Paper text:
The eukaryotic genome is packaged into chromatin by an approximately equal mass of histone proteins, which provide a foundation for modulating gene expression, maintaining genomic stability and regulating DNA transactions in general. Histone octamers composed of H2A, H2B, H3 and H4 core histones assemble variable expanses of ∼160–240 DNA base pairs (bp) into nucleosomes, the repeating units of chromatin. Here we show that nucleosomal constructs with cohesive-ended DNA can be designed that assemble into different types of circular configurations or continuous fibers extending throughout crystals. By introducing DNA annealing as a site-specific and directional driving force, cohesive-ended nucleosomes can promote self-assembly into well-ordered lattices with a variety of possible configurations.
We next tested a series, 351e–357e, where 2 bp were introduced into the shared linker DNA, giving 31 bp relative to the 29 bp for the c and d generations. Out of the four constructs, two yielded well diffracting crystals. 353e gives a closed monomeric system, in which the two cohesive termini have paired with each other within the dinucleosome. Indeed, incompatible termini could be introduced to suppress intramolecular annealing (as occurs in the 353e and 354f crystals).
Author numbering:
A (entry chain A), B (entry chain E): 38 to 135
C (entry chain B): 23 to 102
D (entry chain F): 21 to 102
E (entry chain G): 13 to 118
F (entry chain C): 13 to 119
G (entry chain H): 29 to 125
H (entry chain D): 30 to 125
Write the structure that this text describes.
Amino acid sequence: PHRYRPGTVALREIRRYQKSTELLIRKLPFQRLVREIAQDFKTDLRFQSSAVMALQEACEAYLVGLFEDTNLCAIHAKRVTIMPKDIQLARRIRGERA
Amino acid sequence: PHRYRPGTVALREIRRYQKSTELLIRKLPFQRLVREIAQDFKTDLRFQSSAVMALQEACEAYLVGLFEDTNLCAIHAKRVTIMPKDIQLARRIRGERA
Amino acid sequence: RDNIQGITKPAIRRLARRGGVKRISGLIYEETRGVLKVFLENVIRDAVTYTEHAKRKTVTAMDVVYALKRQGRTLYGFGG
Amino acid sequence: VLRDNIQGITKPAIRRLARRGGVKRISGLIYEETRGVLKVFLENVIRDAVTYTEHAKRKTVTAMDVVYALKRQGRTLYGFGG
Amino acid sequence: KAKTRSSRAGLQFPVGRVHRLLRKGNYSERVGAGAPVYLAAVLEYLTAEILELAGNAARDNKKTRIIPRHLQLAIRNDEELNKLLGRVTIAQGGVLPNIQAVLLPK
Amino acid sequence: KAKTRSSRAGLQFPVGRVHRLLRKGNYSERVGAGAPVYLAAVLEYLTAEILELAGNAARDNKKTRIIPRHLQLAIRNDEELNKLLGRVTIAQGGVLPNIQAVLLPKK
Amino acid sequence: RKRSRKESYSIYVYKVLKQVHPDTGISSKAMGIMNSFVNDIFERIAGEASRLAHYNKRSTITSREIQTAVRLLLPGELAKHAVSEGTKAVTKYTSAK
Amino acid sequence: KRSRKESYSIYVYKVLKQVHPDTGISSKAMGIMNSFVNDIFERIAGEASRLAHYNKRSTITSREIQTAVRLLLPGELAKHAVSEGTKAVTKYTSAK
Ligand SMILES: [Cl-]
Ligand SMILES: [Cl-]
C-alpha cells in the first residue's frame, strides 16, 4: 500500500485539534472520575451537569496549557518528544511543586 | 604559581552568598536607577529611604528567583552555563512574557 | 472504581495535539493521569468546601467557578 | 546627570545574584539580558507605586506605595509595613 | 417625569444597577454619584472593544452569530486584551493555531 | 468590671482590635461576635507555629534573638508554611542553601 | 412564584453588539462568556478602588478611585481609552444635572 | 503628638515568650511577623467576605472564618487552625 511517514499524521492531528474546540476527554469516564475524587471529601454528593462540564472545560484547558509549556521544554533540550522530565520542569517553574 | 580550576571559586562563591542575606547591588547605583525610572512617570518626585530599600529587597529577591528557574533550564539542556535563551524560557513558562 | 485509566492514552494524546506536541513518550500517559488527578482533587476539594458551607448536598457550577477563581484558574461562561 | 544608570547594576553584582541563584557558569550575554529584565520589573513596580503616590496627592513615594505595588504585581513583601 | 441616569451619561450600561452592586458589594461605606457612571462607562467600552474584534473574527469565519472561539480568537490575537485576560480560561474557545517551527518537516 | 475578650478566649491576640478591623475593613455589613475570636485564634496559632520553628532556627545558629533569616529557614523548610507563603518575599531573608548535583565536582 | 430572577448584563451586551456590528449576532455560551467577563472586570475595578480608598482613609469610592483602579488594572492603550470614555461619561452626566 | 501607628508587635512578643521564653526578635524580624499577620488577616477577612456575599449573607460569622481557613490553609495547618479556632470560640462563649 501507501503510508504517511512517522510525524505527518501527528502534524495533522495538531492542525485539526488547534482549529477545533470539542472537549477531547470522553464525557462519562471523566464524570465517574469526578465522583470518585469527590467521595474522598464527602459521600452521597450531587452535581449539576454544568458543574461537571465546568470542571471538564478547565482540566482540559489546563492540561492543554501544560503540554504547551512541556513542549517548549522538550524543545529547549534539542528534542521533539515530550517526556516526564519536561512536565516536571514546567510545573516547577510554574510553581505547582517544589 | 597557585590558581584554582575554573568553576571552583564559583562554587565557593555560591556557598558564601546562599549562607548570607545582604543586598548584593551597591545601594547608590540602585537608588539612582529607581529615580531615573521614576522620571518616566512623574517629574520632581521624592522617595522615603525605606521605599528605595523595599524595592531593592523586592528586585534582588526576584532576580535571585529567576536565576534559580533560569539555572534549571540551562541544566535541562545538559548545560551548566546559563544563557539568555534559559531566562527567556523561564520568563515564558512563568507568564512574564508570550 | 479506578476511573483514572478511563483517561485513555488517545485522549491525552488528543490534548497534547491541541498543545502542539508532535511526539509523545509512553511514560507521559501515566504522568498526565497523575497531574490531572492533583488538579481535579485540588479544585473539587475547594469546590465541595463551597458546597458544604451553603449546606447543599448538590455541587453547583458556581461552587466550581468560585474554586477555579481561588485556585487562580478563573473560568468564563458558567456564571460568576 | 547620568541618564543611563541601568549600567550601575555592575557585572559583579549580577554575578553575585546569580551565585545566590546557585549558578556555577554565566554566559557574557546575560548581564545585559539581566539588566533588561531588572529594568522591566522596576519600571512595572515603580509605575504602580507612583500611581499610588499620585492618588494620595503626595510628591514623596512611600514604603507603603511600594508594598501596595508589589502586592498587586503578585510579588508580596514582608517587613516594610505589610 | 423620569430618566435612567445611563441616558444622562450616554451609556447602554445600567449606571443604576452598577451604583447598587457597588453599595451591596461591600467595597465601601459611601459611593460617589460619579463612581457608578465612570464604571458603567469603562465596563461598556471594554465590552465593545472585545465585541468589535470578535465580530470581525465571526465575519472572517463567515458567521453572523459570535460563538466563544470568536471571543478566544479575538482576545488571544489582541496583545492588550490577552494580557488583561492572562489568567482567564474561555470555555469552548480552544487555542490559537501555533506549531513551533522546529517540529515542521523538510 | 473591665474584662478583655481575648482574656475570655484565652488569646494574647486582640479579639478587640480584630472585631473593629473587620467592621472598618468593609468585608461585610454585620460581623458575628464569635468571628473576631475564631480569627485572632488562628492569627495567634499561625504566629506561634512560625515562632516555634524560627525559635529553633535561632538555637542551631547559636543566637538568642530571631532575625528574618531564622524566619526564612523556618518557613521554607516547612512544606505547609512554604505553600502558604508561596508568593511571599521575606526582606533580609535570603535563600535556603541548595546546589544542584550536576554542578558538583565528581572527584 | 414562576421562579426567582437571575439578573444579567446580556441585554447591555446586545445593545452594544448592535451599536458596533448591527448585522452580527451572538450564541448563548458567548453571551455567557461576556457575562463572566463583565462580572470579572467589575470586581477587579471595584476591589482596587475599595483598597485605594481604604489605603488613603477615604469612606467613599469617588470616580477618581475608579479612574486610578483602571490606570492600575488596564494595559497602556486600553487604560488611556477606558479613562477617556469614563471621563467623557462623567462630564456629560454632570452637565445634564 | 505623632500620628499613632498601631501594629501587632506586642502580641508577637507575648506569643514568642510563651513558645521560646529565653529567645527574642530583631526589629526587621518583628516587621516580618507584623506583615505576616496583616497578610493572613486580609486573606481570611476576604475569603469570608466572599463566602457571605456568595450566599447572600450580610453577617460574617465564625462559620465563614472556619470556611475561609479551610480554603486558604494547607492540610495540617488547616486542621489545627480550625481546632484552636473552634476551641477559642467555645472557651469564650462558656467563660461568659
Ligand atoms: Cl463620584
Ligand atoms: Cl459570630
